[PDB]
């Protein structure tokens, strides 16, 4: 357990009110957030999206990735379902950080691909720790998860990270 | 000088390409970003917007503030001008942090106003350090600034922080 649940408040959006729950990394004070729509109590598996933060795509209208597009799509789909969770996993640039992400982007501007750029900068293709997501689900009292994603490989990755995924729900985009 | 300029890369948006410049706080490694549109060289004052980060408004579609609305409006206006800068000042919740911002929001959900909530949590109404913005402008070779804002008080605040503002340009919203 790398996190603690510290506060919650209302987050009104165009799709309705989500309960915003803030989590804190015990060792660093770094934050993560979960947006909970409706009543997620009960034994029924809970619909959920794991969204890793991308400042450029999520906030700065970047056209070089689909993160912002996916964020809106997931929130919309969860609200439509009427019950669900979106985890905002704050590990920018597959966990290499924003500044290194800009360095990687500069190399990509020169013809390098994301894997090549990261390698030249001294990082693996993906350095994210998804067990932080398992922590958030556990702290929210969630067991079985219906994971929103169009990539079966992501189901494998998250299951390995300790998330009990019982179904893959295509992300409507 | 609290910052150093460390990397830059292209940020394509619906309004055209911005040059994204990443800055690093020398003492913490924390990042800030500047989005530069067009050619800002020359003696002419440069149009600029200082936008303090708001995760909820900028990325999570929050309806409880206008930050996301203002972010889009400023980027649009700068691109229309053809030359300009948007500083993305990363001091969430007037510099009290996201987790404390959620705590403040919880008190606001109970009837407290932002100033009362912050005070109860042990913070002033606004703890931001805008000299970080002056640092970014200096590192970008910018002297005179035409500040995008509808609040004359903000011009006073930023001028006190060391930014040479020669004109206030209403933010078209
Ligand atoms: Zn992205
Ligand atoms: Zn805001």
UniProtKB/Swiss-Prot annotation, chains A, B:
Pathway-wise, it operates in:
Cofactor biosynthesis; riboflavin biosynthesis; 5-amino-6-(D-ribitylamino)uracil from GTP: step 1/4
For activity, the cofactor(s) needed are: Zn(2+)
Sorted UniProt keywords? GTP-binding, Hydrolase, Metal-binding, Nucleotide-binding, Riboflavin biosynthesis, Zinc
Query: What InterPro entries does UniProt report for this protein, alphabetically?
Result: GTP_cyclohydro_II, RibA, RibA-like_sf
| Endpoints of the signal sequence | none
Spell out the reaction equation it catalyses. GTP + 4 H2O = 2,5-diamino-6-hydroxy-4-(5-phosphoribosylamino)-pyrimidine + formate + 2 phosphate + 3 H(+)
- What is any one of the record's Gene Ontology cellular component terms? cytosol
Question: What's a BP term from Gene Ontology annotated to this protein?
Answer: riboflavin biosynthetic process
In terms of PANTHER family, this protein maps to:
3,4-DIHYDROXY-2-BUTANONE 4-PHOSPHATE SYNTHASE, GTP CYCLOHYDROLASE II-RELATED
Protein name, entry field: GTP cyclohydrolase-2
Biological source species: Escherichia coli (strain K12)
Which gene is this protein's source?
A: ribA
């Amino acid at each position: 357990m790398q996190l603690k649940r510290v506060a919650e408040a209302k987050l009104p959006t165009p799709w309705g009110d989500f309960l915003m729950v803030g989590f804190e990394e015990l060792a660093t004070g770094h934050d993560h957030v979960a947006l909970v729509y409706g009543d997620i109590s009960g034994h029924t598996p809970v619909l959920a999206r794991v969204h890793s933060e991308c400042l450029t795509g999520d906030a700065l209208f970047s056209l070089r990735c689909d993160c912002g597009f996916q964020l809106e799509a997931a929130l919309t789909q969860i609200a439509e379902e009427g019950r669900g969770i979106l985890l905002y996993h704050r590990q920018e640039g597959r966990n290499i950080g924003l500044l290194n992400k800009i360095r990687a982007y500069a190399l990509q501007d020169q013809g390098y691909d994301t894997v090549e750029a990261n390698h030249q900068l001294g990082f693996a293709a993906d350095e994210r720790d998804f067990t932080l997501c398992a922590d958030m689900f556990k702290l929210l009292g969630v067991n079985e998860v219906r994971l929103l994603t169009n990539n079966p490989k992501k189901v494998e990755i998250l299951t390995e990270a300790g998330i009990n995924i019982v179904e893959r729900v295509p992300l409507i985009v």
